[PDB]
Amino acid sequence: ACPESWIGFQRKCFYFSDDTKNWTSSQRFCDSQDADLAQVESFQELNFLLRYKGPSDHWIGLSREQGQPWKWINGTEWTRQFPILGAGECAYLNDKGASSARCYTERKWICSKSD
């Protein structure tokens, strides 16, 4: 199904990182591994990632310009199921839900791809 060390949920594979990068640097790596910063499509993909990820904040793959809709990796509009709190431009997961911060700060990250 999924590579060693990668974890699978709902016909899917996610990497949780050991180190801390800024948001774009984290994108490049995920990509380098044929993958993307988690796209958090499902409400359960959220919960799963919250449960597995641990106490550190982790970048996920939503961003936005100041006024704008959260947009996925590719550039599309995010179907706004759950909140994304804060006033950042980069979306991250905290302990309990999704939130936002400046993209240049460093944070562990999660990678999404397929089986």
Ligand X SMILES: *[C@@H]1O[C@H](CO)[C@@H](O)[C@H](O)[C@H]1NC(C)=O
Residue 102 beta carbon to ligand X: minimum distance, rounded to whole angstroms = 10
Pairwise CA distance, residues 73 & 111, whole Å: 12
Residue 115 beta carbon to a second copy: minimum distance, rounded to whole angstroms = 7
Pairwise CA distance, residues 59 & 27, whole Å: 9
Choosing among ligand X, a second copy, none, which partner's interface includes residue 22 (Cβ < 5 to 8 Å by kind)?
Answer: ligand X
Q: In this complex, which beta carbon is closest to ligand X, that of residue 45 or of residue 57?
A: 57
| Contact between 104 and ligand X per CB under 6 A | yes
What are the CA-CA distances from residue 99 to residues 33, 34, 46, 84, 109 (Å)? 25, 25, 12, 5, 14
Among candidates 18, 111, 2, 3, which has minimal Cα distance to 60?
111
Of 17-25, 32-40, 69-77, 90-98: span binding ligand X (CB under 6 A): 17-25
| Contact between 22 and ligand X per CB under 6 A | yes
Q: Which residues contact 82 (CB under 8 A, 6 or more apart)?
A: 40, 43, 46, 97, 98
| Contact between 25 and ligand X per CB under 6 A | yes
Residue 45 beta carbon to ligand X: minimum distance, rounded to whole angstroms = 26
User: What residues line the site for ligand X (CB under 6 A)?
Assistant: 22, 24-25, 104
